[PDB]
Amino acid sequence: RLEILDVTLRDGEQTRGVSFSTSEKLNIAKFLLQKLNVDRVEIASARVSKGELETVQKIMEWAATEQLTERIEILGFVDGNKTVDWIKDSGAKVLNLLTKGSLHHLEKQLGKTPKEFFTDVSFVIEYAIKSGLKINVYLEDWSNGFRNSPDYVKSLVEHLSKEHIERIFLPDTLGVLSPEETFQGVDSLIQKYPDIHFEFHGHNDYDLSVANSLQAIRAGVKGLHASINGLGERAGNTPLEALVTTIHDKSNSKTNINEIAITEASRLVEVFSGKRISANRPIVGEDVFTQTAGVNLYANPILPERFGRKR
Amino acid sequence: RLEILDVTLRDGEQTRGVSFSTSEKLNIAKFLLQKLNVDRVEIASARVSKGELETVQKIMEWAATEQLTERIEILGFVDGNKTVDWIKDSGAKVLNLLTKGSLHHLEKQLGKTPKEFFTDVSFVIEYAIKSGLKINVYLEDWSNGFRNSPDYVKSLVEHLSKEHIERIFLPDTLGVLSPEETFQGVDSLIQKYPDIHFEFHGHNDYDLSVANSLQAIRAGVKGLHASINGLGERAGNTPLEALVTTIHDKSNSKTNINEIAITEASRLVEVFSGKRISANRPIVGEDVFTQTAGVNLYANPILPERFGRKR
Numbered sequence: 001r002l003e004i005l006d007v008t009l010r011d012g013e014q015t016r017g018v019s020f021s022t023s024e025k026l027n028i029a030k031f032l033l034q035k036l037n038v039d040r041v042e043i044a045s046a047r048v049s050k051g052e053l054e055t056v057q058k059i060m061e062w063a064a065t066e067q068l069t070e071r072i073e074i075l076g077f078v079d080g081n082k083t084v085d086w087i088k089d090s091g092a093k094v095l096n097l098l099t100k101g102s103l104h105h106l107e108k109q110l111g112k113t114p115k116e117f118f119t120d121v122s123f124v125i126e127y128a129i130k131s132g133l134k135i136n137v138y139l140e141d142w143s144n145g146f147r148n149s150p151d152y153v154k155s156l157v158e159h160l161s162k163e164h165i166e167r168i169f170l171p172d173t174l175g176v177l178s179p180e181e182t183f184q185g186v187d188s189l190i191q192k193y194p195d196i197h198f199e200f201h202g203h204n205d206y207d208l209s210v211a212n213s214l215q216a217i218r219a220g221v222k223g224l225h226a227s228i229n230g231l232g233e234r235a236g237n238t239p240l241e242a243l244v245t246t247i248h249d250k251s252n253s254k255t256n257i258n259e260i261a262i263t264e265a266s267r268l269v270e271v272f273s274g275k276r277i278s279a280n281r282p283i284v285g286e287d288v289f290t291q292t293a294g295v296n297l298y299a300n301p302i303l304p305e306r307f308g309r310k311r
Numbered sequence: 312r313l314e315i316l317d318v319t320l321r322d323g324e325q326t327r328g329v330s331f332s333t334s335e336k337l338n339i340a341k342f343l344l345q346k347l348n349v350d351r352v353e354i355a356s357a358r359v360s361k362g363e364l365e366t367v368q369k370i371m372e373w374a375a376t377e378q379l380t381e382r383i384e385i386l387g388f389v390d391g392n393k394t395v396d397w398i399k400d401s402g403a404k405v406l407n408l409l410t411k412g413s414l415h416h417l418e419k420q421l422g423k424t425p426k427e428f429f430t431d432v433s434f435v436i437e438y439a440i441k442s443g444l445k446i447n448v449y450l451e452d453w454s455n456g457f458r459n460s461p462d463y464v465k466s467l468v469e470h471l472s473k474e475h476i477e478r479i480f481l482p483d484t485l486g487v488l489s490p491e492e493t494f495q496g497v498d499s500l501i502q503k504y505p506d507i508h509f510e511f512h513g514h515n516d517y518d519l520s521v522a523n524s525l526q527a528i529r530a531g532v533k534g535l536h537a538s539i540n541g542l543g544e545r546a547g548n549t550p551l552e553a554l555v556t557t558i559h560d561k562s563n564s565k566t567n568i569n570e571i572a573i574t575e576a577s578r579l580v581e582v583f584s585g586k587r588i589s590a591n592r593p594i595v596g597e598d599v600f601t602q603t604a605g606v607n608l609y610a611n612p613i614l615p616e617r618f619g620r621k622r
């Protein structure tokens with residue numbers, strides 16, 4: 001009853017020193033969709049470069065072969081026709097539009113009016129639909145936007161509700177929210193728009209992302225974003241492995257993820273990305289199942305074979 | 312207004328492949344108390360072995376030299392006179408007694424009665440006081456105990472309240488609590504015993520320890536336990552660096568920790584302990600301040616120089 005969007009290949013790629021080859025991205029994409037069973041994957045950003053375009057084409061060639069094309073998503077921008085054209089040629093059929101979720105960002109980067117910007121947005125969604133694509137919209141910096149420019153944010157959502165988009169994404173872009181705050185901002189929107197599919201997208205700057213994610217689930221979110229090993233730009237995104245385990249054991253909601261493929265997904269991403277995880281990394285670290293001082297008295301609901309390890 | 316107990320040298324030492332030399336423990340102890348300014352440090356477990364006894368003696372020799380002896384604490388057990396004798400010779404003046412916080416543990420390990428066990432407990436506290444020591448009591452497995460054997464737990468606390476101990480520790484020994492749960496169990500006790508100093512001690516098995524810790528602060532806790540780099544047996548203890556930053560920015564409570572010594576405390580522990588931290592480790596990872604894709608628009612309250620880095 002909860003969709004899971006993995007942004008490991010995109011948001012996770014932005015990380016310093018990390019860059020996946022076409023072979024690695026295809027390998028990871030196949031695993032997450034077929035083995036780990038994550039609902040969808042965000043494999044790239046449009047207009048990044050050629051090669052990245054080729055990469056998306058191969059994955060779409062494959063994804064088509066497997067009736068999964070609708071499960072791949074591309075991060076795009078409000079640039080008129082450039083993003084949609086790029087995604088059009090890539091082979092991908094889904095665009096996750098990046099819009100300004102804070103009045104502060106809109107003015108300091110674009111220097112536009114909520115009216116002007118909404119027109120630019122409507123064009124892109126308009127042109128995207130016209131081009132056979134589906135659209136999800138990111139309210140970038142929403143975490144700061146609903147706390148400082150709550151009006152701009154309400155009109156932006158008000159505008160997107162009159163548009164034909166699949167989902168609206170509420171990201172803690174700078175990862176500055178506490179769980180109480182995440183609940184407020186999300187509850188605020190879900191209660192005004194009970195018919196829109198919202199998904200929370202947290203970042204782990206204060207090591208609160210999965211806790212925040214839980215509160216978002218309380219507020220009424222229908223999906224969550226996460227990356228393997230919490231790969232991402234700063235402290236990374238919400239760590240997929242701990243989020244799912246936490247959703248399964250500490251919430252009445254469910255997920256379609258196969259807990260058993262969790263250890264391999266991690267090893268895969270760790271090797272290919274080249275970013276080592278600590279031995280104590282929750283659920284997925286090397287020594288996380290080892291209790292040397294504990295002298296089934298100290299049995300934890302977190303067992304090695306539950307995640308495809310030690311058996 | 313919130314005490315911080317660092318268990319990096321003890322609970323953190325239990326970790327697989329980790330063992331600090333007398334020189335390293337002294338170095339870390341001095342830094343945490345003098346530089347990082349953590350209220351107290353738990354440097355060892357009594358009766359572990361000789362050498363560890365020597366180590367505590369040197370630190371006490373030093374701590375005395377600096378009028379800090381009352382800030383060092385030793386993990387002890389309910390063994391009659393053995394623990395108190397050991398701590399007596401060590402030089403340490405504070406004992407953190409390990410008691411059974413769950414009826415399940417008491418019976419499956421000791422096979423004793425709440426009455427019998429309380430008598431053994433009262434002896435140790437009795438004999439400890441008689442020996443010039445101060446006492447804090449750990450309700451081991453409390454996280455499972457207040458959810459399954461809430462009665463045993465209420466009498467245990469009821470008994471400890473009639474004793475002359477400094478504080479009572481509420482540990483999520485197996486790290487299985489959600490923030491909502493942590494609030495319930497802690498609020499439950501604080502409301503029955505408004506005059507006792509309770510401290511939460513979380514573990515990061517679900518990557519919820521600092522979120523749990525925040526709720527404990529809500530419930531009315533007066534202190535928190537944590538380890539540098541979240542060092543600890545399984546997923547480790549609550550990560551000190553993220554806890555403090557989170558307490559400072561996301562709660563109305565305060566701490567006496569010097570945020571500036573945070574990066575060095577981490578490097579110190581990482582090297583000496585030999586457990587590498589990931590580059591994305593919140594607040595304290597190598598690339599945690601780097602945003603390569605972010606194109607002061609993306610200014611986070613988490614700056615490098617705030618923690619003694621990049622300047």
Ligand SMILES: CC(=O)SCCNC(=O)CCNC(=O)[C@H](O)C(C)(C)COP(=O)(O)OP(=O)(O)OC[C@H]1O[C@@H](n2cnc3c(N)ncnc32)[C@H](O)[C@@H]1OP(=O)(O)O
Pocket residue numbers: 292293294295322325356358359360386388389390451484
């Ligand atoms: C949640 C918790 O922290 S559970 C804590 C359990 N144990 C500890 O904290 C002690 C940690 N031990 C050490 O650091 C040891 O020096 C090591 C591990 C480095 C090397 O020796 P080990 O034998 O591996 O240590 P071990 O794992 O046995 O430590 C457990 C200690 O708990 C002691 N213990 C636990 N309950 C009792 C009790 N009721 N009465 C007496 N001793 C007890 C055990 O006796 C042992 O100490 P001792 O056998 O030397 O007297």
Ligand SMILES: CC(=O)SCCNC(=O)CCNC(=O)[C@H](O)C(C)(C)COP(=O)(O)OP(=O)(O)OC[C@H]1O[C@@H](n2cnc3c(N)ncnc32)[C@H](O)[C@@H]1OP(=O)(O)O
Pocket residue numbers: 011014045047048049075077078079140173603604605606
């Ligand atoms: C919260 C966020 O995720 S902010 C996202 C910002 N940027 C991205 O997501 C794109 C990531 N870029 C890449 O992966 C690149 O291929 C790299 C970094 C690997 C190598 O090239 P770089 O130049 O370093 O990428 P860069 O950091 O510039 O990426 C930013 C992109 O946002 C694009 N962009 C942002 N806003 C707009 C806009 N309003 N109109 C057009 N393009 C925009 C920039 O143009 C750039 O893409 P482009 O210059 O190729 O058209």
Ligand SMILES: [Zn+2]
Pocket residue numbers: 011171173201237
């Ligand atoms: Zn993001």
Ligand SMILES: [Zn+2]
Pocket residue numbers: 322482484512548
């Ligand atoms: Zn512990």
